[PDB]
C-alpha cells in the first residue's frame, strides 16, 4: 500500500503494476478473510471456529492497510465497521488497551510491546482512520497518553 503510495506520491507511476498489485491486494484481502471472526476481528488462525479471539496490534495493522488501500480503490464498509465495534468494547473507562494476544512470533512486531505503545498505536491508528479526533473513546486513549 505504502510502496504504491510512495510511487504515486512521487509520480513514479505505471498502470499494469497496479494490475499486478490488484491481484496482490485482492488475494491478500481475502486471505485476511481466511482468519477473522464473524464478530469481525483478526488473529493468527481464525476462521472455521470460535475457539480464539482477535488482536489489538495486528487488527490495527490490518485496518491501517484497510484504510489506505481503501483510500485508492473500492472497499465495502460494514466489516471494518464491526471491527470498530470490537475495538470500541475493548478498553477501560479510564485506563488503556489490552494486548489480548493470540499472535504468531516474537519479532514480527518491530515494537517491543510496551502497554504504553500498545494502547497508543491502537488509538492513533484508529485516528489514522477517516474518523474524528473527538470521540470519547480516543479521549480515554488521550487520558492513557498523558498517563503514559
Amino acid at each position: 500500500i505504502y510502496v504504491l503510495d510512495y510511487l504515486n506520491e512521487t509520480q513514479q507511476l505505471t498502470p499494469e503494476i497496479k494490475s499486478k498489485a490488484i491481484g496482490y491486494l485482492n488475494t491478500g484481502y481475502q486471505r485476511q478473510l481466511n482468519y477473522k471472526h464473524y464478530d469481525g476481528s483478526y488473529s493468527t488462525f481464525g476462521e472455521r471456529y470460535g475457539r480464539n479471539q482477535g488482536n489489538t496490534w495486528l487488527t490495527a495493522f490490518v485496518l491501517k492497510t484497510f484504510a489506505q488501500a481503501r483510500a485508492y480503490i473500492f472497499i465495502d464498509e460494514a466489516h471494518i465497521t464491526q471491527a470498530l465495534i470490537w475495538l470500541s468494547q475493548r478498553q477501560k473507562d479510564n485506563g488503556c488497551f489490552r494486548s489480548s494476544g493470540s499472535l504468531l512470533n516474537n519479532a514480527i512486531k518491530g515494537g517491543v510491546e510496551d502497554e504504553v505503545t500498545l494502547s497508543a498505536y491502537i488509538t492513533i491508528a484508529l485516528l489514522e482512520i477517516p474518523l474524528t479526533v473527538t470521540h470519547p473513546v480516543v479521549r480515554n486513549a488521550l487520558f492513557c497518553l498523558e498517563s503514559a
Binding site: 464498509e77 465497521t81 470498530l84 474518523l131 473527538t134 470519547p136
Partner: protein, 49 residues
C-alpha cells in the same frame, strides 16, 4: 445512586460508530432514589446502526 457526595450527574451518553453524530444528555444524582431518566433518539441515515 447513594452514598457520599450526590454532587454527581450520571449520564447515558451517545457517540455513534462511524463518521460523527451524538445524543448527549445529562441525568441528575441524588442518593438512593430510583429516578429514571426517559431520554430518546431520532432516526439516522442507515436503518440498523
Amino acid at each position: 445512586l447513594s452514598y457520599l457526595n450526590e454532587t454527581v450527574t450520571v449520564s447515558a451518553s451517545l457517540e455513534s460508530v462511524r463518521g460523527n453524530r451524538s445524543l448527549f444528555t445529562d441525568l441528575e444524582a441524588e442518593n438512593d432514589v430510583l429516578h429514571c431518566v426517559a431520554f430518546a433518539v431520532p432516526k439516522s441515515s442507515s436503518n440498523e446502526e
